Write an enzyme that holds these catalytic residues in place. Structure first.
Site, PDB file in Angstrom:
ATOM      1  N   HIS A  91      30.337  35.029  -3.429  1.00 21.56           N
ATOM      2  CA  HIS A  91      29.688  33.962  -3.426  1.00 21.56           C
ATOM      3  C   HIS A  91      29.209  33.358  -2.252  1.00 21.56           C
ATOM      4  CE1 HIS A  91      33.850  32.228  -3.081  1.00 21.56           C
ATOM      5  NE2 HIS A  91      33.231  31.691  -1.859  1.00 21.56           N
ATOM      6  N   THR A 151      44.966  28.430   6.865  1.00 20.37           N
ATOM      7  CA  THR A 151      45.080  27.240   7.327  1.00 20.37           C
ATOM      8  C   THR A 151      46.093  26.154   6.994  1.00 20.37           C
ATOM      9  OG1 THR A 151      43.242  26.168   6.638  1.00 20.37           O
ATOM     10  CG2 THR A 151      42.792  27.617   8.780  1.00 20.37           C
TER      11      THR A 151
HETATM   12  C1  LIG Z   1      42.762  29.117  -4.426  1.00 18.12           C
HETATM   13  C2  LIG Z   1      41.208  29.310  -3.731  1.00 18.12           C
HETATM   14  O1  LIG Z   1      40.850  30.276  -3.914  1.00 18.12           O
HETATM   15  N1  LIG Z   1      40.621  28.076  -3.132  1.00 18.12           N
HETATM   16  C3  LIG Z   1      39.345  28.205  -2.701  1.00 18.12           C
HETATM   17  N2  LIG Z   1      38.651  29.091  -3.116  1.00 18.12           N
HETATM   18  N3  LIG Z   1      37.918  29.763  -2.235  1.00 18.12           N
HETATM   19  C4  LIG Z   1      37.570  28.215  -1.885  1.00 18.12           C
HETATM   20  S1  LIG Z   1      36.115  28.312  -0.894  1.00 18.12           S
HETATM   21  N4  LIG Z   1      35.450  29.785  -0.633  1.00 18.12           N
HETATM   22  O2  LIG Z   1      35.198  27.395  -1.647  1.00 18.12           O
HETATM   23  O3  LIG Z   1      36.489  27.757   0.283  1.00 18.12           O
HETATM   24  S2  LIG Z   1      38.716  26.974  -2.501  1.00 18.12           S
HETATM   25 ZN   LIG Z   2      33.966  31.090  -0.075  1.00 16.45          ZN
END
Ligand SMILES: CC(=O)Nc1nnc(S(N)(=O)=O)s1
Ligand SMILES: [Zn+2]
EC number: 4.2.1.1
Length: 260
Positions: free
Chosen positions: A94, A198
């Site tokens: 994504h 983090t």
């Molecule tokens: C558990 C988990 O995967 N949390 C996050 N997912 N990816 C995220 S992001 N790319 O939107 O920072 S929130």
């Molecule tokens: Zn992401």
């Protein structure tokens, strides 16, 4: 200096944190990646990656954020190279957004920041599934792809037409026969930055990789998302961005990287 054997006071108490090298190796420190300080390390094993069968089938939204799906029923694309004990397969990815009309990415490389970046998560198939990979630090790794603005549409006119279909979040649209390789080069060398999240010392089964050849994207591609909602229509005109991450530099002596 001599360590008398026969006892083990420290070998007595044992906890979750004391079990895994999560607390024994705390590297939780967000920092911007620097190419100037980077150093070439030809220690890794040169290998060839595949991506000729890589193809998408459809795109589903989660009512706010959507990811591209691929046909894992075949050998799309695989990554390999280094001291890894198993190849890494990709399934979906994504892209994030920015709050500014020029930049706003997660991390910043070469003291420079981008507008958006791709997030390709992969898991070592050698261990079966991420469930068995999380059992070890070098189990599953995460590939970090970046996107640069060129204002030069690489022939994605049709990609903009189909976009008008997903104006609101929560819907989907079948779209196959995608060409992700047309913008992704072979990529032989690339910098790296392994470590943990983090967040408090919990898990370190996540690695952060960075390719020296980020995928190029036109400002026209994101210019359409700017008019889109952040979570379905009917809500106040607000940006769909929500992927900001800090990385203040403390000093940064030398960063590990396969490329100079
Ligand atoms: C558990 C988990 O995967 N949390 C996050 N997912 N990816 C995220 S992001 N790319 O939107 O920072 S929130
Ligand atoms: Zn992401």
């Amino acid at each position: 200096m001599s360590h008398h054997w026969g006892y083990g006071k420290h070998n007595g108490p044992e906890h979750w944190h004391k079990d895994f090298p999560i607390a024994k190796g705390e590297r939780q420190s967000p920092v911007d990646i620097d190419t100037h300080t980077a150093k070439y390390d030809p220690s890794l094993k040169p290998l060839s990656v595949s991506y000729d069968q890589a193809t998408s089938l459809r795109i589903l939204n989660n009512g706010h954020a959507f990811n591209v799906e691929f046909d894992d029923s075949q050998d799309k694309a695989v990554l390999k190279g280094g001291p890894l004990d198993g190849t890494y397969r990709l399934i979906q990815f994504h892209f994030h957004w920015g709050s500014l009309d020029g930049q706003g990415s997660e991390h910043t490389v070469d003291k420079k920041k981008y507008a958006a970046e791709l997030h390709l998560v992969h898991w070592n198939t050698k261990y079966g599934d991420f469930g068995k990979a999380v059992q070890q630090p070098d189990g599953l790794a995460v590939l970090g792809i970046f996107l640069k603005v060129g204002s030069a549409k690489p022939g994605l006119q049709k990609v903009v037409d189909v976009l008008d279909s997903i104006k609101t979040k929560g819907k989907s649209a079948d779209f196959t026969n995608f060409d992700p390789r047309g913008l992704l080069p072979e990529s032989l060398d690339y910098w790296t930055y392994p470590g943990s999240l983090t967040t408090p010392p919990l898990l370190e089964c996540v690695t952060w990789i960075v390719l020296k050849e980020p995928i190029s994207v036109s400002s026209e591609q994101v210019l359409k998302f700017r008019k889109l909602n952040f979570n379905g229509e009917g809500e106040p005109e607000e940006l769909m961005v929500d992927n900001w991450r800090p990385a203040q530099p403390l000093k940064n002596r030398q960063i590990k990287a396969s490329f100079k």
